[PDB]
Enzyme design. Sequence first.
Site: not given
Length: 423
Positions: A56, A59, A204, A402
Amino acid sequence: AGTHDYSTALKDSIIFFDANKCGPQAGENNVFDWRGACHTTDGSDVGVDLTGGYHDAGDHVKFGLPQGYSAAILGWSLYEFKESFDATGNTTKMLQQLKYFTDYFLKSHPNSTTFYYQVGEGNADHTYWGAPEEQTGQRPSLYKADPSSPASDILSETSAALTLMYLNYKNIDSAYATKCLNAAKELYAMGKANQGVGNGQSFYQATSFGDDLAWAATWLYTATNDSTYITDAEQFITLNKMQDKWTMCWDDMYVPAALRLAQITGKQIYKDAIEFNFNYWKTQVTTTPGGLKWLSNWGVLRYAAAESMVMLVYCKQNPDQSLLDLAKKQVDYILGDNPANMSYIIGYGSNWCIHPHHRAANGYTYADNAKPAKHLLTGALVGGPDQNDKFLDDANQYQYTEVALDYNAGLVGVLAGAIKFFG
Ligand SMILES: [Ca+2]
Ligand code: NI
Ligand SMILES: [Zn+2]
């Protein structure tokens, strides 16, 4: 800058996906020599081969909603701006990235009423820091959709991704393309049969599925010319989101769905929804001194790129100079035209982020995860700056560093559109 290299940025943004490939064949035709086979036993806990797909973000969990959304947006980019990929010689690589997604979706659909959509458990996966190739043990096939377990949003985004593959691959391998369309029809059927959002743990948390069903329905119409899908779409999109103050993202697909319905039905209600959202972004959305449209704090560039992509798709049929100028400013900001004098795409332009929150690229374990990334994560769009245009390039500031599949999905699309209108 007077001129920008959108072509190279596009190539890089597509290459990024190679860094997140998962499975026994992850290293095959991979541009990064530091990536290899990983999580080769996925699905063994339920007796189904669930290997493949993509990690994803930084990770290694494969989350169904962003996985499907990303595949759908990349497919949409190729469908709407195919010329941009052909002209820059990126079509072949793009198709490879897409097929890696669809091969996984097909394997995850063992029978007509079952669809596995999450491999790995978020909490545990995040306690690990090292290369995905060395992460051993057992990953759980945590969630699946079936007649008693709804996941309408996930099923619909996956359906759309598969239908788009049919549309983008039918001229290359019609048999594979049809396999994708047949699966797309079944996943859509599952999604409308039992309605509700799928599970994504606390990572999510979804809030809507009517947008996804409508979106998936418009693509099935484009592929089959069967009006019944539009009858469904008009009903699902109204399940007030017709005045969306957000933008296209993994959880909210109301704007993209409205855009397609306006094109297909010509109804004023959909045209007004699009106009509202666009005009809202023109003057209501916060603008940093540097010119960046700042929607929220997390994944800020991801939002700017996504809205810009939608505006450029809209401009194909309804050229609006105000939209082209806005979109161009957001893209140019990402490429380096900002107060921080840095490219927000790693490996492109100048003074890029050296601390991406990405395990594989970082290359260290718990012996140094705070040091600068050992490997170059070419093409990754980072979170972005604060509303003051400031960027903190360091170890623990995840909001800024990120990277993720859904971040780059929209970037590829806007860059493809930029090449068409400004290239
Ligand atoms: Ca949704
Ligand atoms: Ni410029
Ligand atoms: Zn993996």
